[PDB]
A paper describes a structure:
Crystal structures are described for complexes of the two enzymes with adenosine monophosphate (AMP) and glycyl-sulfamoyl-adenylate (glycyl-AMS) at resolutions of 1.65/2.90 and 2.25/1.95 Å, respectively, and for MtrGlyRS in its apo state at 2.85 Å. MtrGlyRS was readily produced using standard protocols, and 37.3 mg of protein were purified from 2 l of culture. The two groups of synthetases utilize different insertion domains, with the group containing MtrGlyRS having a zinc binding motif. A few of the modelled MtrGlyRS chains are more complete, however, owing to the presence and stability of the zinc binding site. AMP orders two [name] recognition loops and a section of the insertion domain, and glycyl-AMS further stabilizes the structure, including the closure of a lid motif. The liganded chains are generally much more ordered than the MtrGlyRS apoenzyme, although major sections of the insertion domain are not visible in the various electron density maps. The complexes with glycyl-AMS are also important for delineating the ordered state of the active sites, which instead show relaxed lid motif conformations or dynamics in complexes with AMP, or a much less well-defined active site structure in the case of the apo MtrGlyRS.
Structures of all three forms – complete, or in some cases partial – have now been determined using X-ray diffraction or cryo-EM. Both Mycobacterial and human cells express the α2 subtype, and notably, the GlyRS gene in humans encodes one product that serves both the cytosol and mitochondria, which has obvious advantages for the design of selective inhibitors. The catalytic core contains the class-II specific antiparallel β-sheet having the characteristic insertion domain after the first strand of the core β-sheet, and the anticodon recognition domain adopts the HGPT fold also found in HisRS, ProRS, and ThrRS.
Numbering used by the authors:
A (entry chain B): 2 to 101, 123 to 130, 134 to 461
B (entry chain A): 2 to 83, 141 to 258, 262 to 343, 353 to 461
């Protein structure tokens, strides 16, 4: 079995993901995130927002509506150019992407017809062109349209960034491998407005910076690469684009896009100034000059980043068991800051004397972290159940704990154990979990 | 001038919110959150998730798609009795085949995964499933400011319980949820319970109402806490064909759990916290945010822009930005800067003066009292941490 299939089976089995509406028929085009998946996803988001907004004086945040005025997508060009060629089979009449011959539904074509990938909706009582709106295909336009508002309230000046996370929607004709390509996804996008003569320099900076981010949160550098977009595959808003690519493990070419870092020159502020009538240029008072900023844009995928982190973390190693033998052990080697469960509190047995201390310790820890309590089954099996989902530390409460008031901390990867007094455990875990 | 108008002006001016698509004509049915608004929003959401999911053994989280299968909303009864749902068309053919609905609530995503969560999370009633997410309603008319919009964020939790306990649990959550708003700094006097009467998917509903200050009747819904009986799990079993009941092996019994549903509005909660924190004293304008909600936790202020002070101030601001959202301000007189920070609820201001070059200490000013205390720099992070009560 391939690595992607293994990781997907693990995710479904342990509740990182469920198929949306599974009981009514789910597709790989729609996924719900279970109790572990939601925490993993939020953790990745939080680390992104820390790196991009909180830690940087030059970058501020925003959250804009999924449904913007239609004119926006006329000015961005998405109405006119955000379309792909579709060919309908002449035997089963199922439409497919032409660029992407034989039919993959029956095997037996019409002339290509352009199909716009944005999703439509209607606001108001009349299902008419007055109420036609597009579910945004990208979060960038809500940033561009607020560039001046932000310059004003935030008192900012180029170079500076506006960052955002949110849901986007594309009418994807076919579902991707697992969660890679879905019709509803979550993006993390930042638009960095710079004085044009510096754009190129700034560009490389962000390409490097973004790359290091993935490495800093645990992704093997060898599983990452850079790809230069050719002029033909350039977006309608881009002059130069570089993609970070991750080795996901697909059949055939195992490499796939992970984050797109684009030099969008002055396109976006220009077009929105032209269409809205509002001047979105920037006035440098230190020089008495006025220019439309260039835009460097790191746009990552939350769900693609979760898939990348989850695949890179997966590993199988030979770990000794209680019998004195050696088993194959499935471990997700997450960075502590991403792991969905930071600590597991595991009484040695269901004994009535161990549950009080174990439960009080679980509560104390829940004050700070997401915690898991499990007294079911043999302890070693529970250690492995936690290792399977990337839990960084297991805290075992045994009978000696009733006398020395100390517990056994077990580190996930090394499986090494250290006995520490309870009244210090929190502190211990804190230093090793590397939160704020 | 009403308090709502004043707060809305302040929110617009300091970039708490902007009207979505302002340059193309905005409406009160759509609002973006600016640099401060996003942070206050995310802080409210984070405190809700900490209270509900992280802190409780008996509650686990989930996040389900906005667009679910159409049969889901045929089974929940929204297609027949709710039309306020927003439609969209998936796939290459724009017809009733691809017709889907944008969820008007986040609950059905939970109900349909009840059995999945019981299985993977190894949970047994009483336990809850919590979710935050975007919901859409084709609201005909927009509300005051950001109170009623077509697109909003919800914080819903469904607590599944053995039926004979529901009523008790119901009251519990009613009280619990209320305390939450109070523990985060809303005045108890501005909160009240409103019992839905028998005439008004549910059996019994209590709304926590906040005194927003509307013209006329200044009260409004802030959070609804309903007892939905066994309606939802029942209907999804029947329509899907999948048994969503629970089997207790301790008693060898099988039942359809009853559901207690606290459901709060992220945007309504933001509007309530903002209106409540607003205040004027001597004159000064202050948002008395709880530290955990304040969009900016600390502002670093050099006495003057100067080669001796500014580097020390910048270094300190970075150290603090490791943990909290910080604001660095070197413009204008120090008291002007204090006023600017008080206006947006910043709990603490740190000033670097010339004395700081000699005793390596700074001046920490507590927003509400305005009391100042001189703290060594190598301790400021701990000093602030103890007082900010989260990061
Ligand atoms: N259909 C999709 N499903 C999941 N992630 C996506 C999808 N489309 C785009 N992304 C992510 O969004 C990022 C930016 O997209 P773009 O703005 O189109 O370059 C990509 O690098 C992906 O990580
Ligand atoms: N259109 C809306 N705008 C803002 N908040 C809303 C809206 N609809 C519902 N809510 C919030 O969601 C909570 C639960 O709603 P419900 O599921 O309708 O009981 C309410 O108490 C509100 O706080
Ligand atoms: Mg920042
Ligand atoms: Mg929990
Ligand atoms: Zn065919």
């Amino acid at each position: 079995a391939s690595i992607i299939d293994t990781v997907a089976n693990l995710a479904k089995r342990r509740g990182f993901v469920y198929q949306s509406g599974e009981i009514y028929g789910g597709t790989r085009s729609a996924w719900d995130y279970g109790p572990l998946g939601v925490e993993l996803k939020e953790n990745i988001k939080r680390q992104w927002w820390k790196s991009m907004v909180t830690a940087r004086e030059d970058v501020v945040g925003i959250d804009t509506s999924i449904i913007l005025p239609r004119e926006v997508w006329v000015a961005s060009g998405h109405v006119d150019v955000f379309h792909d060629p579709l060919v309908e089979c002449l035997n089963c009449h199922r439409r497919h992407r032409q660029d992407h011959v034989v039919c993959p539904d029956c095997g037996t074509w019409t002339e290509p017809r352009e199909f716009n990938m944005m999703l439509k909706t209607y606001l108001g009582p009349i299902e008419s062109d007055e109420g036609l709106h597009y579910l945004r295909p990208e979060t960038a336009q809500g940033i561009f349209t607020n560039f001046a508002n932000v310059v004003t309230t935030a008192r900012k000046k180029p170079p500076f960034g506006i960052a955002q996370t949110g849901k986007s929607f594309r009418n994807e004709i076919t579902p991707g491998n697992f969660i890679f390509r879905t019709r509803e996804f979550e993006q993390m996008e930042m638009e960095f407005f710079v004085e044009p003569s510096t754009a190129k320099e700034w560009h490389q900076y962000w390409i490097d910076t973004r790359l290091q981010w993935y490495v800093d949160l645990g992704i093997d550098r060898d599983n990452l690469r850079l790809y230069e977009h050719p002029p033909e595959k350039l977006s309608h808003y881009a002059e130069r684009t570089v993609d970070i690519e991750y080795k996901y493990g697909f059949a055939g070419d195992p490499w796939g896009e992970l984050e797109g870092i684009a030099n969008r020159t002055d396109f976006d502020l220009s077009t929105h100034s032209k269409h809205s009538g509002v001047d979105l240029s920037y006035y440098d008072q230190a020089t008495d000059t006025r220019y439309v900023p260039y835009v460097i844009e790191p746009a990552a995928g939350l769900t693609r980043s979760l898939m990348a982190f989850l695949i890179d973390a997966y590993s199988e190693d030979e770990a000794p068991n209680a019998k004195g033998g050696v088993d194959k052990r499935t471990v997700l080697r997450f960075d502590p800051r991403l792991a969905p469960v930071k600590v597991a509190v595991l009484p040695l047995s269901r004994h009535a004397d161990l549950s009080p201390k174990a439960r009080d310790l679980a509560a104390e820890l829940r004050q700070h972290w997401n915690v898991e309590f499990d007294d079911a089954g043999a302890i070693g099996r529970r250690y492995r159940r936690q290792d399977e989902v990337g839990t960084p530390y297991c805290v075992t409460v045994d009978f000696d704990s009733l006398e020395d008031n100390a517990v056994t901390v077990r580190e996930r990867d090394s499986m090494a154990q250290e006995r520490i007094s309870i009244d210090q455990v929190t502190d211990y875990l804190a230093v090793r979990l590397k939160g704020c």
